[PDB]
Design a protein around this nucleic acid. Sequence first.
RNA 1: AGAGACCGAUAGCGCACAAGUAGAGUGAUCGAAAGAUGAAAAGCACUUUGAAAAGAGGGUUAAAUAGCACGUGAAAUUGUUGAAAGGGAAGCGCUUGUGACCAGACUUGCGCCCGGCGGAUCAUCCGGUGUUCUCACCGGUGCACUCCGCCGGGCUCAGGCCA
RNA 2: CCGGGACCGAGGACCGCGCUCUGCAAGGAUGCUGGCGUAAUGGUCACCAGCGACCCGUCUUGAAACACGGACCAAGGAGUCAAGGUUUUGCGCGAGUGUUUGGGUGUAAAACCCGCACGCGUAAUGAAAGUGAACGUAGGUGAGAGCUUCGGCGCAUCAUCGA
RNA 3: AGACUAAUCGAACCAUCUAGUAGCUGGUUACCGCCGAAGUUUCCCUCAGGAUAGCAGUGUCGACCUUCAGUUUUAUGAGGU
RNA 4: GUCCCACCCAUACCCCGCCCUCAGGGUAGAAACGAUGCCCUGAGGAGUAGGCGGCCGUGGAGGUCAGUGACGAAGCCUAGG
Lengths: 52, 124, 148, 141, 183
Amino acid sequence: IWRKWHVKINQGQKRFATASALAASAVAPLLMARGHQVSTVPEVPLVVDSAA
Amino acid sequence: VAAKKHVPIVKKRTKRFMRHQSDRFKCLDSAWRKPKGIDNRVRRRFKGNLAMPSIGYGSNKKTKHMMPSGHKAFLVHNVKDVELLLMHNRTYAAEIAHNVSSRKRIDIITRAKQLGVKVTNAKA
Amino acid sequence: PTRFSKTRKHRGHVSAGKGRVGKHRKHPGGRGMAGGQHHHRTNLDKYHPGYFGKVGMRHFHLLRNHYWRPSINIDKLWSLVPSDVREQYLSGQKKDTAPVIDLLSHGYAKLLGKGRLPEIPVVVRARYVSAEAERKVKEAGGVVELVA
Amino acid sequence: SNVSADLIWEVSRNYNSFLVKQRTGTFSRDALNLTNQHSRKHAGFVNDKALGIVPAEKGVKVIAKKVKAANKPASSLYTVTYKSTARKAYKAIASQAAKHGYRADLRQAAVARASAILRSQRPVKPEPPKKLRGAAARRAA
Amino acid sequence: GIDLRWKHVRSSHRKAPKSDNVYLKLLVKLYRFLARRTEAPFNKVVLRRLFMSRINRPPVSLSRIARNLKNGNEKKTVVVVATVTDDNRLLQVPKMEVAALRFTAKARARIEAAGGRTLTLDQLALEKPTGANTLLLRGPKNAREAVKHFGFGPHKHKKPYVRSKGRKFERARGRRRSRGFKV
RNA sequence: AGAGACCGAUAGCGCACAAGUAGAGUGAUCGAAAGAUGAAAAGCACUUUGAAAAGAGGGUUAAAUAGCACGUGAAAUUGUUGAAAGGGAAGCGCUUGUGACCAGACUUGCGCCCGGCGGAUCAUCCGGUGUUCUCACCGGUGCACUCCGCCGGGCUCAGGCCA
RNA sequence: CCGGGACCGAGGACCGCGCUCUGCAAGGAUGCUGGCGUAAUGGUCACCAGCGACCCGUCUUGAAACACGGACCAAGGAGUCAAGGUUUUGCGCGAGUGUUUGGGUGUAAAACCCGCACGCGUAAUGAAAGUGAACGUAGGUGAGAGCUUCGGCGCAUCAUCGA
RNA sequence: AGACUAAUCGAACCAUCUAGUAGCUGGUUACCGCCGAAGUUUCCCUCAGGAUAGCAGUGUCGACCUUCAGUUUUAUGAGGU
RNA sequence: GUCCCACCCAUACCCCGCCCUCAGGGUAGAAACGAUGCCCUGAGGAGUAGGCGGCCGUGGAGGUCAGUGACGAAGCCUAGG
Ligand SMILES: [Mg+2]
Ligand SMILES: [Mg+2]
Ligand SMILES: [Mg+2]
Ligand SMILES: [Mg+2]
Ligand SMILES: [Mg+2]
Ligand SMILES: [Mg+2]
Ligand SMILES: [Mg+2]
Ligand SMILES: [Mg+2]
Ligand SMILES: [Mg+2]
Ligand SMILES: [Mg+2]
Ligand SMILES: [Mg+2]
Ligand SMILES: [Mg+2]
Ligand SMILES: [Mg+2]
Ligand SMILES: [Mg+2]
Ligand SMILES: [Mg+2]
Ligand SMILES: [Mg+2]
Ligand SMILES: [Mg+2]
Ligand SMILES: [Mg+2]
Ligand SMILES: [Mg+2]
Ligand SMILES: [Mg+2]
Ligand SMILES: [Mg+2]
Ligand SMILES: [Mg+2]
Ligand SMILES: [Mg+2]
Ligand SMILES: [Mg+2]
Ligand SMILES: [Mg+2]
Ligand SMILES: [Mg+2]
Ligand SMILES: [Mg+2]
Ligand SMILES: [Mg+2]
Ligand SMILES: [Mg+2]
Ligand SMILES: [Mg+2]
Ligand SMILES: [Mg+2]
Ligand SMILES: [Mg+2]
Ligand SMILES: [Mg+2]
Ligand SMILES: [Mg+2]
Ligand SMILES: [Mg+2]
Ligand SMILES: [Mg+2]
Ligand SMILES: [Mg+2]
Ligand SMILES: [Mg+2]
Ligand SMILES: [Mg+2]
Ligand SMILES: [Mg+2]
Ligand SMILES: [Mg+2]
Ligand SMILES: [Mg+2]
Ligand SMILES: [Mg+2]
Ligand SMILES: [Mg+2]
Ligand SMILES: [Mg+2]
Ligand SMILES: [Mg+2]
Ligand SMILES: [Mg+2]
Ligand SMILES: [Mg+2]
Ligand SMILES: [Mg+2]
Ligand SMILES: [Mg+2]
Ligand SMILES: [Mg+2]
Ligand SMILES: [Mg+2]
Ligand SMILES: [Mg+2]
Ligand SMILES: [Mg+2]
Ligand SMILES: [Mg+2]
Ligand SMILES: [Mg+2]
Ligand SMILES: [Mg+2]
């Protein structure tokens, strides 16, 4: 039971990766290339006027 | 339809490179295995014994992977997959997977007849 | 990750890369530091020259707090003051005011002197100070006074 | 900026959802991909200018990409339906792809796909019945 | 028989980066085209130096740049395919323009504070495709802790592997004639 | 009490079952093997042969190629039917021959001309819409020598195998 | 300078070198013709025939050995994990670097945030008391990629003489 | 008589330490491609075993300096078969 | 015993086809490319102990094929491809 289960990674690289994911979330071709169905969305940064 | 003109196909070998001593024991399969014995006659290439597979038996790039008709096999599973061969009807041929139902088999055959794609296993 | 390791490339090959005549037995040669003076002497004198012997006097109940005195050189002395004021001093707009740096508050006790110092007077409060550092601080217009 | 067609090709170069890779070759099931091959030249979804051809109920349907509305996918497609004549559709597609420098290298594939679609909409002739060679003696009884 | 000493001998230098950075792949494509279709040896040298590993691309400092910015080189372009690090010892930084693979935050701040400009390898290729009026620089390759342990032996004065330092660790026999001999 | 990038009946605790049981030793102690018919027994009424056990009919079920030796039923080994070889071993490699069986390709396509037939408008033009802002589409106009399919005749070209 | 015979046909618009120069034997085969369009060509399996061919694994200078293990089949069956080192490859920051002992928060063994100390590095040398890194644009000489106003400036590194 | 002490005696049987240690026998599981050895030097209560040097592979960097050679020629020394 | 003609055959030598390895070149005012691609040219291929690279299968986990299936999934047999 004392094998190494969890791992430790730098917070700087964690923050780098989550920022890379946010940057890659604004590219529509990647959205289609990942299998999403976004053929009928007006703007790829979808924003709602606080109706919820 | 017929395929494009190509150079003649040469196989360089037809036999299957059976495993040494697999014709005398039933516990050994016929799949080839490299012998690691210190004094094996096949590993030592004695005259009059089984041959060994080498990289020198490879085929020409032009006729590699193509069946004697001239096409290349392509495994299909439904009617949406066979539509990928729209632009390749003189180079590729379709082959329906073994677990496809009879209804989808006749749907694939019907669509392929209009698209002109040859089907290797259709008489069923 | 076991999918990439050399033990899988040894499958089908007898002796698993350890040799036929020499068969990788359990513990040939002994365990640990055995044979230091008898059969591992060539390794222990070509490498690690100085393993055996006694040198120096012994100390009973050593407390390392008695021997705590981190040091800082003089070429990093200006790095203690903040950047905004440091650029003002280096640019030369005061001409009438001098800073007093307290090494203890930053965690240092002795001021060594290795590099050069610009011609601006300063005052340093240190537990210890070197002779060359004192000379350089005097030739820079400053003065150092012990604070304990 | 930090993003371009070359970068998107680099990111989706090794694996993507539209890829169908197996033995004897690799293909791509992309709407904006002609010849259904996996290559930078024919990858419609990464390039700024691309073409696509889809069969309609009677004729051809041609879709193109509008570079001005890349961030607006709902209105970034130029669609047109050709159902008049084969030669007229051939000329319209060729001019649409080789008159204003909008991917002039895809003219041959764009016209060819339309030709294949029109060839595939005619009625099919009935295949002649198969003969027998070694089972003829068995079936004689 | 053919009587050769070597056959099927491989090359000794890298022919492709081991890193999988996409931007580095783009930069390699750019400089592979420039080096193929340009007469300047500067392009071939930068292309090869882009292949190097991290231990073969040591950092250079602002002080080291100021060292080579004398004797009539104040107007040239410094090219360093490595990281650039600020030096705390240098109090006044001269005015210069630097093109480097990447900069530290404080080094960039002090360069733009002094009145300089920080470039990028793509801007360098855009302004000086042939590398005119430039000087290349490297960091200290042998200034590494691991190099002090290399080639240990008698009468070589290298550094040994010890778990600690003190009067009980090594010294003794073989380091002084008071206990046997010396090395 | 709640969970798993754990094992899945030679595995996982010795024990998924009347398991610390059956069993061995005077005794301290040692210590197993063994899960699965079908949704529901609806677990074969009755006739006949036979000393009996059993068999053949005939029945239930989607199935008895699921019958309480019961899901799927491989190899070692054995029986019958079919084919073949054998003068102190057999097996194997290269290359023909004889006998048994068999996968492909082929069955035309393209273009042109002449005639017949059904057509429905081709170029052009103007109005609107989109666009890569110069090309497209749609609304109407055409008028037999345009365009578009069908048939019959002819012509050329190329297309299987062995020489 | 004239005969006879054998094996082969790689490449796929033009570009080049030449000649006997409306053309050619000059950077790789084309032309005419016959039979058959199926078991004909071809492929698999079984048998006879010509030549070849000692039983595997292992120790050993030497194994087909009168050296050892092996009657046959099915399932199981052997370089793994932890702590501490070392070199190399990839990544982040950089004279600094490391959030997770702990606290806040949470869609709750996940994710996110927070701070004093502390670890390694920034200064060594002696047994110890102790002391502690610039004469020079941080030195001189011989080689050095590259740049250059063409005179020269000279990274990394090697050797050598000094501080 | 080293005899007998539950088919066990020149030191009974049962469980645990215990997966006791072994310089000694036996075994060690898919394919292809490229390179490719040693039984020799020194030390060890060492001679069926190790460390050390040698042979080998992989990862490289600086030249491409033009650099070198199990070789011949010319000039000039040593040797005691 | 000596001399002289013709003739037979190795995985050896010469020419041609194909495979792999290594080495040297060409490819963007992109009518462009699994740029890890394509095209041109030359040489080489034996191997235990051992070293490195590329690939084929088995049990599970994340993402994706809007994947196959009681009109038959998995498994098993098969001198049928
Ligand atoms: Mg084969
Ligand atoms: Mg041998
Ligand atoms: Mg081996
Ligand atoms: Mg062994
Ligand atoms: Mg050993
Ligand atoms: Mg003494
Ligand atoms: Mg059990
Ligand atoms: Mg069982
Ligand atoms: Mg059990
Ligand atoms: Mg059962
Ligand atoms: Mg009955
Ligand atoms: Mg009865
Ligand atoms: Mg059934
Ligand atoms: Mg059943
Ligand atoms: Mg039974
Ligand atoms: Mg059964
Ligand atoms: Mg059987
Ligand atoms: Mg026989
Ligand atoms: Mg025999
Ligand atoms: Mg007519
Ligand atoms: Mg009409
Ligand atoms: Mg009209
Ligand atoms: Mg109209
Ligand atoms: Mg009319
Ligand atoms: Mg011929
Ligand atoms: Mg003919
Ligand atoms: Mg035949
Ligand atoms: Mg013989
Ligand atoms: Mg012997
Ligand atoms: Mg043997
Ligand atoms: Mg004998
Ligand atoms: Mg023995
Ligand atoms: Mg025996
Ligand atoms: Mg098994
Ligand atoms: Mg470790
Ligand atoms: Mg700290
Ligand atoms: Mg030079
Ligand atoms: Mg000078
Ligand atoms: Mg006696
Ligand atoms: Mg007794
Ligand atoms: Mg005794
Ligand atoms: Mg006992
Ligand atoms: Mg053990
Ligand atoms: Mg070799
Ligand atoms: Mg001794
Ligand atoms: Mg020895
Ligand atoms: Mg032995
Ligand atoms: Mg003599
Ligand atoms: Mg003598
Ligand atoms: Mg003598
Ligand atoms: Mg190349
Ligand atoms: Mg050879
Ligand atoms: Mg080899
Ligand atoms: Mg798997
Ligand atoms: Mg498992
Ligand atoms: Mg379904
Ligand atoms: Mg099935």
